[PDB]
Amino acid sequence: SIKQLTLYTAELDRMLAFYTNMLGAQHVHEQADAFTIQLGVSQIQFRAAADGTKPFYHIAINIAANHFQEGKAWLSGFGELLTENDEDQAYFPFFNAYSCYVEDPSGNIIELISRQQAAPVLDKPFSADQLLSIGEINITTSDVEQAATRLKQAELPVKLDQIEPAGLNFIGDQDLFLLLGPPGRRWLFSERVAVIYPLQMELDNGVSLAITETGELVI
Ligand SMILES: Cn1ncnc2c(=O)n(C)c(=O)nc1-2
Numbered sequence: 038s039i040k041q042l043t044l045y046t047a048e049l050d051r052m053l054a055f056y057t058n059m060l061g062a063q064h065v066h067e068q069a070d071a072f073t074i075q076l077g078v079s080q081i082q083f084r085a086a087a088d089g090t091k092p093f094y095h096i097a098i099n100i101a102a103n104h105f106q107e108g109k110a111w112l113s114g115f116g117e118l119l120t121e122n123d124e125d126q127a128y129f130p131f132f133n134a135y136s137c138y139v140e141d142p143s144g145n146i147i148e149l150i151s152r153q154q155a156a157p158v159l160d161k162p163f164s165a166d167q168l169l170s171i172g173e174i175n176i177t178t179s180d181v182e183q184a185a186t187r188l189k190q191a192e193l194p195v196k197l198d199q200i201e202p203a204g205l206n207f208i209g210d211q212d213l214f215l216l217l218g219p220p221g222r223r224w225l226f227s228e229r230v231a232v233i234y235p236l237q238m239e240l241d242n243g244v245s246l247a248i249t250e251t252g253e254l255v256i
C-alpha cells in the first residue's frame with residue numbers, strides 16, 4: 038500500500054479548507070507551505086506548487102465493499118459528482134468495483150472506489166473515518182516503457198510485454214493500482230487531459246519513487 042504520497046497544488050489555502058471540511062480537522066494537518074491529509078493507512082502531503090503551474094492528479098480512495106452508496110452520497114456533499122456518458126458512477130468489471138468522482142479546488146479528480154471482492158465488508162455506517170487507503174494514483178510519465186521497467190526493477194507486478202506506451206496501464210493488484218500512462222489522454226469523468234506533474238511516493242514495503250517535473254520515473 039501507499040504509506041506516503043507527496044503532491045503539489047497551486048491552491049493551498051482553498052485545498053486546506055476543502056479537505057478540512059471534507060475529512061475533519063482530526064485527519065488534516067496544516068504545516069509550513071504544505072498540509073497533510075490522512076486517508077486510512079495512506080497519507081498525502083500537498084505542497085505549494087511552483088508559480089506558473091497548476092498541478093493536478095487522479096487519486097482514488099479505497100472504501101469498503103458495502104459502503105458505495107453511502108460513500109457516493111457523502112462525496113456529493115462536497116461538490117457536484119462528475120459524470121461520464123451521462124452516468125454519475127461507474128462499474129469497472131476489471132476491478133469488480135464501483136466508483137464515483139468529484140473535483141477538488143485544484144482540479145484533482147478524486148474518486149471513491151468500492152472494490153466488491155477486493156475490499157472488506159465493514160458492518161458499520163460509512164463516514165469520513167472509514168476511508169481505507171489510496172487505491173489509485175496516476176503515474177503520468179514522459180517514458181512509459183522506462184517507467185514500467187523501473188517499476189518492475191522495484192519489485193512491482195509488471196508484465197513488460199503487455200505495456201502500452203500510448204495508453205493507460207494498470208500496475209498492481211489487490212486494492213492498489215498505479216495508473217501508468219502518457220500525458221495527453223483525457224481522464225474519464227473529467228474535461229482534463231493528463232499532464233505531467235511531479236510527485237513522490239513511499240510504499241509500505243519501503244520502496245521510494247518519484248516523478249520529476251519533466252515526467253521521469255525514478256526509484
Ligand atoms: C480506463 N479506466 N479504468 C478504470 N478507471 C479509470 C478512471 O478512474 N479514470 C479517471 C480513467 O481515466 N480511466 C479509467
Ligand SMILES: [Mn+2]
Pocket residue numbers: 095097148173
Ligand atoms: Mn480511477
